[PDB]
Write a protein that binds this ligand. Structure first.
Ligand code: ZN
Length: 197
């Protein structure tokens, strides 16, 4: 229904250039999700669209959790759209932890939401914190997917670097598949220097 790519493009959330990503791969694009989430009206509309997919799955989500900082707004709007509670994990002494008095009930059905899933590494660190507290991780969610992890309802395949488990669904609005080059085989490196975004 919502034109996802046009939303991100109009918001100037799509940076074109030469970037060294967290996976070690070089790309001609980078996504700045904060440029979309800056607008609560856009964030709500995207979260309502995401919730439709989640509800079709009948997973009985009781709580949405996000790893701080970037995943916070997306997960929070998703929790509002689902009519459930929202909690977040944060890095304390360089390790993911659940603070702020947030508590998890034993076997609480939690969806781990991010603003964007690249490798799914931060989402996995968040899920491990919750599982150790007795929670059941039933799904992963994101507004945008980088085509590294496979999302539900897509004909794309999971790639090298994917960290999310194969037995749990990932729900995302769209796949933002960019050129991914190995650093020793990057065509952009011939013309410019790759910078960390
Ligand atoms: Zn390069």
């Amino acid at each position: 229904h919502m034109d996802i790519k046009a939303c991100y493009q109009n918001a100037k959330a799509l940076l074109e250039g030469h970037f060294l990503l967290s996976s070690g791969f070089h790309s001609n694009y980078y996504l700045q999700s904060a440029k979309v989430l800056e607008d609560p009206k856009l964030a709500e509309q995207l979260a309502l669209e995401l919730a439709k997919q989640i509800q079709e799955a009948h997973l009985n989500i009781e709580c949405v959790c996000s790893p701080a900082i970037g995943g916070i707004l997306a997960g929070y709007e998703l929790a509002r759209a689902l009519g459930v509670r929202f909690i977040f994990t944060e890095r304390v002494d360089n390790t993911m932890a659940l603070r702020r008095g947030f508590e998890v009930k034993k076997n609480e059905k939690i969806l781990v939401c991010e603003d964007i899933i690249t490798t799914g590494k931060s989402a996995m660190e968040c899920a491990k914190v919750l599982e150790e507290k007795g929670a059941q991780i039933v799904a992963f969610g994101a507004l945008a997917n980088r085509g590294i992890c496979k999302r539900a309802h897509s004909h794309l395949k999971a790639q090298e670097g994917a960290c999310l488990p194969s037995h749990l669904p990932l729900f995302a609005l769209e796949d933002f598949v960019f050129d991914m080059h190995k650093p020793s085989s990057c065509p952009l490196c011939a013309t410019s220097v790759a910078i960390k975004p």
